[PDB]
UniProtKB/Swiss-Prot annotation, chain A:
Outcome when changing residue 190 to S: No loss of activity
Catalytically driven reaction(s): a secondary aliphatic amine + O2 + H2O = a primary amine + an aldehyde + H2O2; (R)-adrenaline + O2 + H2O = (R)-3,4-dihydroxymandelaldehyde + methylamine + H2O2; a primary methyl amine + O2 + H2O = an aldehyde + H2O2 + NH4(+); benzylamine + O2 + H2O = benzaldehyde + H2O2 + NH4(+)
Modified residues (N6-acetyllysine): 50
Effect annotated for changing residue 392 to A: No loss of activity
Function: Catalyzes the oxidative deamination of primary and some secondary amines such as neurotransmitters, and exogenous amines including the tertiary amine, neurotoxin 1-methyl-4-phenyl-1,2,3,6-tetrahydropyridine (MPTP), with concomitant reduction of oxygen to hydrogen peroxide and participates in the metabolism of neuroactive and vasoactive amines in the central nervous system and peripheral tissues. Preferentially degrades benzylamine and phenylethylamine.
Name of this protein: Amine oxidase [flavin-containing] B
Main location as per UniProt: mitochondrion
Lineage: Eukaryota, Metazoa, Chordata, Craniata, Vertebrata
Gene this protein is translated from: MAOB
Length: 499, 494
């Protein structure tokens, strides 16, 4: 079975790579482990839900590559409901609000909160998107956990608790599990704190009509029989003139080049000849994925809207199974639903329960948070625990524990002879997202076009025109946000005055 | 290819498991990925060295299982040279000493050092060897790195730098990479700080005559054609009556049970049907091995002994490629040599050099520390970088980053249907060592004997009589060591 390029993995990244190469007139094969394409995207269809995303779902302004690819495939977006009030639930009580950040009134707490978000972005600006290990304090920042950074930075428990939730929710891991440098990089390369946490004008603004799984499905339709399902790759041999790729089901593929479009650690499932170089050999043992269960509770009507709640709940407490929800009602206003994430250690703990037991705990939580008995009357439930997936390893993405990004980060997308590396983890803008998957797949594909002498080197990395359908409002700060003192800043001001 | 038990991996753990099952009358097969047995042990033979251990080498008192297995296979030990003085090289000067711990003279630094070692053992006494996640403060300790703990505990740079060397040397990882709970467990389950760092009466007392690779080689000799070399396992299927195990070279093996005797993370190289349970699926992505280059420089004579130095060097600071050495001279006094470890980030950095460039750096360091121009005239050099091994992942062993041991530790030896788990990482005494490899292999084998109805549950875990050849002496402390205050302790008194 001979071709120009074998693509290992049929997620968005591998499918985007294969489509680009196909369009450029090369012969490509996609080898996919599962009986389906889409990977960490999966759209379930049945009569009770019509369609529902159980994996990656949201897209927003500045994610121009996924929007362009989706639009070319004939897909459309709609806006996630944020008409009514958001809810912050903390210490057993709900506080409705507007705007992206839960507000605080206590003046000291206000300064601490303001300084926390500001400092995340300040540190971010020191970190190159394409080379985080080149930050001036890369080593110092990489040698501490996010827990350690929050302990230093947050002078109030209020700010520390919200910051903790921010980390758990954005990277499906505990603050003590992840590198501070890596987390700060991750946020900055999404455009900063406001962009990453926002619905309106941020990452959660929109979803695809009919589900995100259609992106991979529609590319498979374009590629025809070039996509091979239930072909897990077990062996890559680069000792001869052409690369040999072998699958579990006893097939051999021969190619000039290979794109690895799988999560970095899942490279461990492949035996390499010759052995990988030392730094990659070790890197792929050091980069786990996070832990999450995505849960959707269906209701007769979006009853929360009648109480002037949009369906967004930011829920702080150890007893709460879910820390974040969004309205998942269809744009037509039917199949009323609340989507919630069970995160990090809670995914581990609550996976021990039955599906029926998890549904009951979510409804009881939502009833309390929304002050609504109607939340106790679900009509349907769907969920997906991504921790159990052999060919994902977790969700949403790969996290770096302390010390790893500075020692091993440079080899993430370094070619190994005729193997090139795609997958969202290798992106420099919205790495961890569907957007980053498209950036990495197309970049890897063009690395091979360059190696073949079909394009000049300056065309490997390509800028993306802004979407005309999803324009990006700039991120702005106020004078007060920029110049109000931190808590230690204020204490320094007090000590000075009184002298 | 039908048998009773397939053992995946022909390291010491897999070989110990296979031998026990074979001796009890079961039909075993060992599937080994490499063209050799031994795994993280490897003995090279050539005329220049006679033999040299390039992997695991040292054994000592309280490691009774590896000593008993080796004795049964016809091996003998000899004592690592510790007759003359040890050296601590501090801020560019050598300070000779005797006894296991580098001493200190400044009274404040003395209290801080004393408190650091004492506190490691105090904390270890609250950590169960067989269940570190059941420590009273398991979450608190697991959620900190060793770097954070040392930052709290060490009031002097002196103590912090020696404690950092201790971590780097013992677990081939940086203090910021590893869980405090995991590291404290690791030390405790080797018998404490004195036992783990000591040559005389500790882990480094002895080596095997002819090399540690003989343990795995001589078990392979017993088992004959039951050991299959260059058979990397790619696929395990437990859907049917018997377990099916497939190798990369297209062979299929059928058995009633399987022993996985490979480092935990290397489970990722196997495709499982049905999929592994969630907790193991994620665990095996969270447990890396450390980074080390083991380096042996040969000389015409053990010239250091003439200056009343034994060859042990403890070398502080960033600039030194090697933080620790031992005399590697043969018991007969010939093939004179110094063994050194290049640790953690330095293994990563110095791997970019040539073999000749590393030799030069080592020789110049040793000349400075030993105070002898003779160190600049090596006659031979051997090294091994364990970071490059596909079927090890690193050395010496698996380390646990912050948060992982409490969340996933319970799954390490939990059977998955008819797969049982061996490997040194699953031991409860000298886990990470050749001793733990034997303990785990034999325990996993006896779990299968019990599942088969051949032994009672109370015989799965078996005690080991003390070696007559390598008896252990008690670890002792002084009244002052036990009762002198810490630095903050002394400050509260003031
Ligand atoms: C899973 C998931 C989930 C659940 C979710 C999500 C996700 C996920 N995400 C991500 C995505 O999905 C990703 O990135 C992608 O998809 C990726 O792609 P790629 O790279 O392509 O990869 P994959 O898919 O994996 O593919 C691969 C493939 O391959 C294969 N294999 C393997 N192995 C093998 C193979 N083959 C062959 N052979 C071999 N050996 C497989 O099978 C596959 O197929 C996402 N994304 C996006 O975009 N979106 C979304 O949505 C998502 N998701 C999520 C998210 C979430 N979040 C967001 C953010 C938010 C926040 C908010 C806030 C915060 C804070 C606050 C305060 F309060 F504090 F302020 C507020 C708010 C949250 C949520
Ligand atoms: C590598 C190494 C080195 C370099 C070294 C060492 C070691 C290592 N070690 C460890 C040992 O070796 C181990 O543990 C063992 O060996 C293990 O075993 P096992 O478990 O059995 O495992 P392995 O071997 O890995 O095997 C496995 C097998 O499998 C196979 N595979 C895979 N995959 C697969 C397979 N097959 C089939 N299929 C598939 N898929 C493979 O291939 C294999 O074969 C050790 N150990 C002992 O015991 N000893 C020794 O010596 C050792 N080594 C080291 C050591 C070091 N050290 C010690 C300690 C000391 C310290 C001292 C001090 C401190 C401190 C101080 C102050 F100053 F601070 F005070 C002083 C002093 C040093 C170091
Ligand atoms: C007086 C002690 C207050 C500690 C406050 N926290 C926020 C805990 C630490 C500040 C660290 S730093 O001081 O900014 O380095
Ligand atoms: C001083 N150091 C050792 C930096 C911190 C003391 C730790 S603590 O003050 O006992 O937390």
């Amino acid at each position: 079975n001979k071709c120009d390029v074998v693509v290992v993995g049929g997620g968005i990244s591998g499918m985007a790579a294969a489509k680009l190469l196909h369009d450029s007139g090369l012969n490509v094969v996609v080898l996919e482990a599962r009986d389906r394409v889409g990977g960490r995207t999966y759209t379930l269809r049945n009569q009770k839900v019509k369609y529902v995303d159980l994996g990656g779902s949201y897209v927003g302004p500045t994610q121009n590559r996924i929007l362009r690819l989706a639009k070319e495939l004939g897909l459309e977006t709609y806006k996630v409901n944020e008409v009514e009030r958001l809810i912050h639930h903390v210490k057993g009580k709900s506080y409705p609000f507007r705007g992206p950040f839960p507000p605080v009134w206590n003046p000291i707490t206000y300064l601490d909160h303001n300084n926390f978000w500001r400092t995340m972005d300040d540190m971010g600006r020191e970190i190159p998107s394409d080379a985080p290990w080149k930050a001036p304090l890369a080593e110092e920042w990489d040698n501490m956990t996010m827990k350690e950074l929050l302990d230093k930075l947050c002078w109030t428990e209020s700010a520390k608790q919200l910051a903790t939730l921010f980390v758990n929710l954005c990277v499906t891991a505990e603050t003590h599990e992840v590198s501070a440098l890596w987390f700060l990089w991750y946020v900055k390369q999404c455009g900063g704190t406001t962009r990453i946490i926002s619905t309106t004008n941020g990452g959660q603004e929109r979803k695809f009509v009919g589900g995100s799984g259609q992106v991979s499905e529609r590319i498979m339709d374009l590629l025809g029989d070039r996509v091979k399902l239930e072909r897990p790759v077990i062996y890559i041999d680069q000792t001869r003139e052409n690369v040999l790729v072998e699958t579990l089901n006893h097939e051999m593929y021969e190619a000039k080049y290979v794109i690895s479009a799988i999560p970095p650690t899942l490279g461990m499932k492949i035996h390499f000849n010759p052995p990988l170089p030392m730094m990659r050999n070790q890197m792929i043992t050091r980069v786990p994925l996070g832990s999450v269960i995505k849960c959707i509770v269906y209701y007769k009507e979006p009853f929360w809207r009648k109480k002037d709640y949009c369906g967004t709940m930011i829920i702080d407490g150890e007893e709460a199974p879910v820390a974040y929800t969004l309205d998942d009602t269809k744009p037509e206003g039917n199949y009323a639903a609340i989507m919630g994430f069970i995160l990090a250690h809670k995914a581990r703990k609550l996976a021990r329960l039955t599906k029926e037991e998890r549904l009951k705990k979510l409804c009881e939580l939502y009833a309390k948070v929304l002050g609504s008995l109607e939340a106790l009357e679900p009509v349907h439930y769907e969920e997906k625990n991504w921790c159990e997936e052999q060919y994902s390893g977790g969700c949403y993405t790969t996290y770096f524990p302390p010390g790893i990004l500075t020692q091993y980060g440079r080899v993430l997308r370094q070619p190994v002879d005729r193997i090139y590396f795609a997958g969202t983890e290798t992106a420099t803008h919205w790495s961890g997202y569907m957007e980053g998957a498209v950036e990495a797949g197309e970049r890897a594909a063009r690395e091979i076009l360059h190696a073949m002498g079909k394009i000049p080197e300056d065309e490997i990395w390509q800028s993306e025109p802004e979407s005309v359908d999803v324009p990006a409002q700039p991120i702005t700060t106020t004078f007060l946000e920029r110049h109000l003192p931190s808590v230690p800043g204020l204490l320094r001001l007090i000590g000075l005055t009184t002298i």
